[PDB]
């Protein structure tokens, strides 16, 4: 096994966790700040969560911007960038799921970006030239992405069919309110999506090259084990507080930097999946459920050791040849996704694979030609993975 | 099974981890600052670490203060506090173990304390009235306490036989340099002490009362499993980087706030142990190895469920009655400490238990009369625990 690489870990986001944790929200925002509350397509109005937020900040200088959609659009967000500049917003409060949080991270950085440069430049450069951003916090209504306490975001330009990520410490939220009760109203589709996303985030940082990082491994395995136990329960028992709190906390811990610090990371499943969302409109987690089992089969030898550890530690699979244990672990993973209600073949979404050449052209356009922890997933390999996922 | 309590988790310490991670040190400290490098009895001069730190901060306005011995003494630290006030120090850099870091946390707070109040008041109030402190960073040479990325400190006043803790967010280090290579020089005694302290920190937050916090449980179990595997290897292979890296990271993750957030915590072993260090001079971890097995036997009824989970998850103990399993778990724990070279009976250290009445007087003086997660360890229970530890 290889060793940990040197790392620099900073996890500054203050977490306010639990039932009624919104009581601590007002405290976190500077009293003289001009706050823009961002939110999504309207679920927060129906549930009363937006009203709770507005009441927490009663008397403060508050504006609202609604309409940030799943796979948040540059086209949507430029409206808020204009508003933020013209109204001199000095603090952003994101209320919703990962799309709302990510859209708000983009607004935060875009507002301070050089005036004469199209802020889509952030996505073309992965956020490396971001020098500052408007501070933000969040109230998370959907556990999936860990965006509440990480420095990443995924923004789409819908006109041209691009879905790309950026990263910058400047868009790391100052705080996050995590109240499991706010997740009770999630449609099961989204509950399942969130369990899958947290699961896949974990394996992107854990089912990789073997490194003797025992805490990282145990923590990753712990998240996976918890999602397998309580994920399905969150569908059967939607208002079980303990179950929903376990899922919410698992999703946070899957991508705040801790389990990936100094260890090789894959992300190929994510990169391949992004193109499926961009071209075909599939939910982010749906694309991962399709790509992951096909990718793991294709990459079963570079990933042999960690697939075998995963098989044993997460699924209690120990018997047979390495090939048999890996087949069984992949099958168990596919079944887990399917049983959550997340199908794992392109044909389940009415896609026959004729779009694969077009997806590869988009991968190439986006510089996704040497994917994976070994930088060995070329366009011919990506073609084979997509083909296997039909 | 009970539920998670609401919590407020903030872990702001930047971690610079790995071989030669001191190359990131200079960047962290403000150029304009007047830095006081604090250190211990002299090992840092002998090894070469203090020179690496001075080399890293070459040209900057630095001062030095050595002499902070294990169980950092109020008398010594007040000499540092006077130096900090006279020289207008604006930043502290602790280079050493937990005693050095903790002593520096006290210097940081006591220096800003009201001039006409004895800053030992900090320990009388547990740090509750601390309004500010001089910012600090650290370079850790001994993994044990997790003090590098927590807001706690334990100071001794040798004059009056006191060893007491304070807590304040103001003494949380801005950064911590964690280079496993610096731990290679640790005497076996201190390697063992660190493994034990990390182990006990974890069980203080985990072997309590059953709460359905699955991530907390898996993470705590993960630290414990890792310390059992690689702790003995750190003695046998002192220069094995991967092994030393696993132990160092485990100790960090054992007390940064993560695994204890919203869950019941015990700390009774620590409170009873502090009085053994103050009275008899035992290393902190030696006092924990003595007290823990005795306390668990005494509290086997209230701790039943988590002792059984501990037994299964950490020691693979599944067969037999509940009492047989608990006995085997306690026995396994005791053996583990002993095989690290840390005896678990007072008589192993030449203490016959005649000091127990005097220990109870000190516990009473310090308000340690209703200890444990159920606040039910009274002085007569503490007597019973000490007596069983003979
Ligand atoms: N920042 C990051 O590090 C990452 C972000 N990712 C990105 O995150 C986005 C997905 O975020 P999610 O949190 O999964 O979901 P969305 O925010 O899109 O929301 C999905 C739907 O759920 C609904 N919803 C959210 N909270 C609800 C509530 N409690 N009650 C009822 N409905 C609720 C939303 O409905 P509304 O828009 O009406 O609010 C939305 O349709 C995708 O765009 C994905 O690419 C991922 O790529 C991830 O891998 C990495
Ligand atoms: N801040 C906190 O959260 C807590 C701190 N605790 C407190 O922490 C203190 C113990 O700290 P540790 O890190 O275990 O050890 P110390 O700092 O006292 O040092 C012990 C000896 O180790 C030696 N040492 C440290 N780094 C070395 C190196 N790498 N090479 C060779 N020798 C080295 C030290 O020798 P020197 O003084 O010459 O430097 C010391 O004698 C005790 O006073 C304890 O009460 C604990 O109570 C803990 O439970 C919680
Ligand atoms: Zn301790």
| Best of B51, B95, B144 for a ligand 2 pocket test (most atoms within 8 Å of beta carbon) | B144
DSSP state, residue A303: T
Distances (CA, A) of A6 to A260, A317, B132, B153, B186: 12, 33, 32, 28, 21
Let me know: does A344 contact A179? Beta carbons within 8 Å. no
Strands (E), A72-134: 91-96
Query: What does the alpha-carbon distance between residue A319 and residue A326 come to, in Å, rounded to a whole number?
Result: 10
Nearest to B73 by CA among B243, B278, B252: B278
**B146: region left, alpha or beta (phi > 0 left; psi from -120 to 50 alpha):** left
Tell me whether residue B146 is in a domain: yes
* CATH label of the domain that carries residue A54: 3.40.50.1970
Both ends of chain A: CA-CA distance in Å? Answer: 35
Residues A250 and A385 in one domain: yes
Distances (CA, A) of B77 to B80, B152, B172, B205, B234: 5, 16, 18, 30, 32
Let me know: does A46 contact A73? Beta carbons within 8 Å. no
Query: The dihedral of CA B68, B71, B74, B75: what is its sign?
Result: negative
Let me know: does A40 contact A68? Beta carbons within 8 Å. yes
Query: What does the alpha-carbon distance between residue B195 and residue B228 come to, in Å, rounded to a whole number?
Result: 9
Q: How many residues does chain B have?
A: 390
| Number of the ligand closest to the Cα of B100 | 2
Q: Nearest by CB to A17, which of B6, B14, B245?
A: B6
CB atoms within 10 A of CB A316: 9
CA of B274 to the centre of ligand 3 (A): 9
Domain end among A186, A213, A246? A186
Q: B106-124: buried (b, 16+ CB within 10 Å) or exposed (e) per residue?
A: bbbbbbbbeeeeebbebbe
Structural domain count of chain B: 2
Strand pairing partners for B153?
B166
Nearest to B203 by CA among B92, B332, B65: B332
| CB-based burial label for A34 (10 Å; 0-12, 13-18, 19+) | middle
| Number of the ligand closest to the Cα of A269 | 1
| Chain A residue numbers touching B221 (CB-CB < 8 A) | 218, 222
Nearest to B327 by CA among B309, B354, B307, B345: B307
Residues A260 and A160 in one domain: no
* CATH label of the domain that carries residue A194: 1.20.1090.10
Q: CB within 5 A of ion ligand 3: which residues?
A: B 197
Residues spanned by the domain of B55: 12-186
Nearest to A132 by CA among A170, A173, A174, A106: A170
Let me know: does A359 contact A379? Beta carbons within 8 Å. no
B300 CA to centre of own chain: 24
Tell me whether residue B1 is in a domain: no
- Using DSSP's 3-state secondary structure scheme, residue A222 falls into helix
Q: Nearest by CB to B16, which of A8, A212, A249?
A: A8
Query: What does the alpha-carbon distance between residue B165 and residue B131 come to, in Å, rounded to a whole number?
Result: 17
Query: What does the alpha-carbon distance between residue A68 and residue A72 come to, in Å, rounded to a whole number?
Result: 6
φ and ψ of B229, to 5 deg? -75, -55
DSSP state, residue A211: B
Domain end among B167, B186, B205? B186
Residues B256 and B368 in one domain: yes
Strands (E), chain A: 7-17, 34-39, 61-65, 91-96, 136-140, 152-157, 162-167, 175-178
SS (H, E, C) B340-363: CCCCCCHHHHCCCCCCHHHHHHHH
Confirm whether residue B150 is marked as ligand binding: yes
CA of B31 to the centre of ligand 3 (A): 35
Query: What does the alpha-carbon distance between residue B73 and residue B188 come to, in Å, rounded to a whole number?
Result: 24
Tell me whether residue B7 is in a domain: no
Q: What is the DSSP string of A247-290?
A: HHHHHHHHSSSTTTTTS----HHHHHHHHHHHHH---HHHHHHH
Show Cβ contacts of residue A204 under 8 Å, excluding neighbours closer than 6 positions: A265, A266, A267, A269, A270
Q: Looking at chain A, which residue has its C-alpha nearest residue B175?
A: A10
Show Cβ contacts of residue B3 under 8 Å, excluding neighbours closer than 6 positions: A241, A242, A245, B211, B212
Q: Nearest by CB to A246, which of B10, B18, B214?
A: B214
What was the structure determination method?
Answer: X-ray
Cα-based torsion angle of the residue sequence A18, A21, A22, A24 in order, rounded to the nearest 10 degrees = -150
| Chain A residue numbers touching B256 (CB-CB < 8 A) | none
Query: What does the alpha-carbon distance between residue B112 and residue A163 come to, in Å, rounded to a whole number?
Result: 51
Radius of gyration, CA atoms only, chain B: 20
Let me know: does A43 contact A185? Beta carbons within 8 Å. yes
Query: What does the alpha-carbon distance between residue B172 and residue B151 come to, in Å, rounded to a whole number?
Result: 4
Query: What does the alpha-carbon distance between residue B70 and residue B284 come to, in Å, rounded to a whole number?
Result: 9
Nearest to A66 by CA among A111, A100, A27: A100
Size of interface A-B (CB pairs under 8 A): 128
Query: The dihedral of CA B240, B241, B244, B247: what is its sign?
Result: negative
CA of A340 to the centre of ligand 2 (A): 49
Cα atoms in the 13 Å half-sphere on the side-chain side of A154: 21
Let me know: does A152 contact A123? Beta carbons within 8 Å. no
Nearest to A41 by CA among A119, A97, A109: A97
Residues B149 and B240 in one domain: no
Let me know: does A139 contact A95? Beta carbons within 8 Å. yes
Residues A200 and A109 in one domain: no
Query: What does the alpha-carbon distance between residue B378 and residue B363 come to, in Å, rounded to a whole number?
Result: 10
Task: Tell me if B214 and A7 make a contact (CB, 8 A cut-off).
Answer: no
Tell me whether residue A210 is in a domain: yes
Query: What does the alpha-carbon distance between residue A329 and residue A316 come to, in Å, rounded to a whole number?
Result: 9
Nearest to B289 by CA among B351, B335, B222, B230: B335
Q: Looking at chain B, which residue has its C-alpha nearest residue A14?
A: B10
Nearest to B379 by CA among B364, B389, B365: B364
Show Cβ contacts of residue B94 under 8 Å, excluding neighbours closer than 6 positions: B38, B39, B100, B101, B103, B104, B105, B136, B137, B138, B139, B173
Residues B210 and B166 in one domain: no
Strand pairing partners for A122?
none
Residues A361 and A288 in one domain: yes
Nearest-atom number in ligand 2 for the CA of B197 is: 49
Cα atoms in the 13 Å half-sphere on the side-chain side of B68: 33
Residues A28 and A151 in one domain: yes
Both ends of chain B: CA-CA distance in Å? Answer: 35
Residues B174 and B193 in one domain: no
Let me know: does A167 contact A147? Beta carbons within 8 Å. no
Tell me whether residue A1 is in a domain: no
Tell me whether residue A164 is in a domain: yes
CB atoms within 10 A of CB A45: 13
Q: Are strands B136-140 and B91-96 parallel, antiparallel or unpaired?
A: parallel
Query: What does the alpha-carbon distance between residue A305 and residue A296 come to, in Å, rounded to a whole number?
Result: 12
SS (H, E, C) chain B: CECCCCEEEEEEEEEEECCCHHHHHHHHCCCCCCEEEECCCCHHHHHCHHHHHHHHCCCCCEEEECCCCCCCEHHHHHHHHHHHHHCCCCEEEEEECHHHHHHHHHHHHHCCCCCCCCCCHHHHCCCCCCCCCCCEEEEECCCCCCHHHCCEEEEEECCCCEEEEEECHHHCCCEEEECHHHHCCCCHHHHHHHHHHHHHHHHHCCCCCCECCHHHHHHHHHHHHHHHHHHHHHHHCCCCHHHHHHHHHHHHHCCCCCCCCCCCCCCHHHHHHHHHHHHHCCCHHHHHHHHHHHHHHHCCCCCHHHHHHHHHHHHCCCCCCHHHHHHHHHHHHHHHHHHCCCCCCHHHHCCCCCCHHHHHHHHHHCCCCCECCCCCECHHHHHHHHHHCC
Query: What does the alpha-carbon distance between residue A16 and residue A51 come to, in Å, rounded to a whole number?
Result: 18
Residues B84 and B209 in one domain: no
Domain end among A186, A219, A250? A186
Residues A156 and A215 in one domain: no
Residues B124 and B262 in one domain: no
Strands (E), A28-183: 34-39, 61-65, 91-96, 136-140, 152-157, 162-167, 175-178
Nearest to A43 by CA among A153, A183, A246, A239: A183
Let me know: does B267 contact B207? Beta carbons within 8 Å. no
């Amino acid at each position: 096994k290889a060793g940990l690489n040197n790392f620099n870990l900073h996890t500054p986001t203050r977490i306010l966790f639990g039932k009624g944790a919104i009581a601590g929200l007002r405290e976190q925002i500077p009293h003289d700040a001009r706050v823009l509350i961002t939110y999504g397509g309207g679920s927060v109005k129906k549930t009363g969560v937006l009203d709770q937020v507005l009441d927490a900040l009663k008397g403060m200088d508050v504006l609202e911007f609604g309409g940030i959609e799943p796979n948040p659009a540059y086209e949507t967000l430029m409206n808020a960038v204009k508003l933020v500049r013209e109204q001199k917003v000095t603090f952003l409060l994101a209320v919703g799921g990962g799309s709302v949080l990510d859209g708000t991270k983009f607004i935060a950085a875009a507002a301070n970006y050089p005036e004469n440069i199209d802020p889509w430049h952030i996505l073309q450069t992965g956020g490396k030239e971001i020098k500052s951003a408007i501070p933000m916090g969040c109230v998370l209504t959907l556990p999936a992405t860990g965006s509440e306490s990480n420095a990443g975001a995924v923004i789409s330009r819908k006109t041209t069919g691009d879905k790309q990520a950026f990263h910058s410490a400047h868009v790391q939220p100052v705080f996050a309110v995590l109240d499991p009760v706010y997740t009770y109203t999630l449609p099961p589709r989204q509950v399942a999506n969130g369990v899958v996303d947290a699961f896949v985030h974990t394996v992107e940082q854990y089912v990789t090259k073997p490194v003797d990082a025992k805490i990282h491994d145990r923590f990753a395995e712990g998240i996976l084990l918890t999602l397998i136990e309580d994920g399905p329960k969150a569908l059967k028992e939607p208002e079980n507080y303990d179950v929903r709190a376990n899922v919410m906390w698992a999703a946070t811990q899957a991508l705040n930097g801790l389990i990936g610090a100094g260890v090789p990371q894959d992300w190929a499943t994510h990169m391949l999946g992004h193109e499926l969302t961009a071209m075909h409109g599939l939910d982010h987690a749906q694309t991962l459920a399709i790509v992951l089992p096909a990718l793991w089969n294709e990459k079963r030898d570079t990933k042999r050791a960690k697939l075998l550890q995963y098989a044993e530690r997460v699924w209690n699979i120990t018997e047979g040849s390495d090939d048999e244990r890996i087949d069984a672990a992949i099958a168990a993973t596919r079944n887990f996704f399917e049983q959550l209600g997340v199908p794992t073949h392109l044909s389940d979404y009415g896609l026959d694979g004729s779009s694969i050449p077009a997806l590869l052209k988009k991968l190439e356009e986006h510089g996704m030609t040497q994917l994976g922890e070994n930088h060995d997933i070329t366009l011919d390999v990506s073609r084979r993975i997509y083909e296997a996922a039909r």
